[PDB]
Amino acid sequence: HTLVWGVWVNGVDQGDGRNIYIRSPPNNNPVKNLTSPDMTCNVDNRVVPKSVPVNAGDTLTFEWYHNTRDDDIIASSHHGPIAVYIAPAASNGQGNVWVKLFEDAYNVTNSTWAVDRLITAHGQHSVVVPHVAPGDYLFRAEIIALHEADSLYSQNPIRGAQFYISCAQITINSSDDSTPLPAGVPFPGAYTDSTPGIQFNIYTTPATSYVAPPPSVWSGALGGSIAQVGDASLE
Ligand SMILES: *[C@@H]1O[C@H](CO)[C@@H](O)[C@H](O)[C@H]1NC(C)=O
Ligand SMILES: [Cu+2]
């Protein structure tokens, strides 16, 4: 159970984004049905009034929370990976449009899942904005919680992988378009019952065997991190 509060651009808080530049759902419940249109941008996908301006090369930070800003972020049990995708905003998320910018599943050194590190980061994880064409984009941040993923939702709807999905409206102003955006994958559609990483037993299988769901990260992606960039208690 987790939601996005807002974003930071180069370490500067853009302010409460809920239903303003985040297409916020009503609550922090997971999406579980892989074929549902809710997989795109969660249960209340509509255009909201603002878009955050950024330039290529900026650091765009998502900030998640559980019930209130800068709380426990998400239950420790919800181990799983984090990914960020981008699509042109005009698609409204439909079609083969989502390109993956970031993936973090299990870091073998630190012996932590992406979610565990997100808690330590006070809910913050970032991507560097890529050199795509100026215009309006959706950034889709996705957490997969695996603690009931030994079952498939389609077989047993009280269990299954849990998807926490948030779409932010981002306007890219200045970019040299050195890496124009390719075609991507559809949501719903990219993940099926047989996709690696959707069904997994975290209690018996060692995390070093986990493979996160495709697609792989685009070669035009400029990186990112799970790491606190600003202190919500101050700004
Ligand atoms: C999943 O969503 C699809 C598409 O809306 C729907 O047809 C199907 O009934 C849902 N599955 C379950 C198990 O509720
Ligand atoms: Cu939860």
Author numbering: 1 to 235
Publication passage describing the model:
Lytic polysaccharide monooxygenases (LPMOs) are copper metalloenzymes which cleave polysaccharides oxidatively and are important in pathogen biology, carbon cycling and biotechnology. The Lentinus similis family AA9 isoform A (LsAA9_A) has been extensively studied as a model system because its activity towards smaller soluble saccharide substrates has allowed detailed structural characterization of its interaction with a variety of substrates by X-ray crystallography at high resolution. Fungal LPMOs are some of many enzymes secreted by fungi to break down plant matter, namely cellulose, and release glucose. LPMOs randomly oxidize recalcitrant crystalline cellulose, disrupting local crystallinity and creating new cellodextrin chain ends that serve as additional starting points for the endo- and exo-activities of glycoside hydrolases.
Here, the joint X-ray/neutron room-temperature crystallographic structure of carbohydrate-free LsAA9_A in the copper(II) resting state refined against X-ray and neutron data at 2.1 and 2.8 Å resolution, respectively, is presented. No residual F o − F c electron density was observed for an alternate conformation of His78 flipped away from the active-site Cu2+. However, residual F o − F c electron density indicated that a Cl− ion from the crystallization condition alternatively coordinates the Cu2+ ion instead of His78 as observed in the structure of LsAA9_A previously solved at pH 3.5. The occupancies of His78 and Cl− refined to 0.75 and 0.25, respectively. The N-terminal amino group is neutral. The distances from H2O-eq and H2O-ax to Cu2+ are 2.1 and 2.7 Å, respectively, confirming that the copper ion is in the resting oxidation state, copper(II), and validating the use of the X-ray data for joint refinement. In the structure presented here, Tyr164 is positioned in the axial position of the copper with a Cu–OTyr distance of 2.80 Å. The Tyr164 OH group forms a hydrogen bond to the side-chain carbonyl group of Gln162 with an OTyr164–OGln162 distance of 2.72 Å.
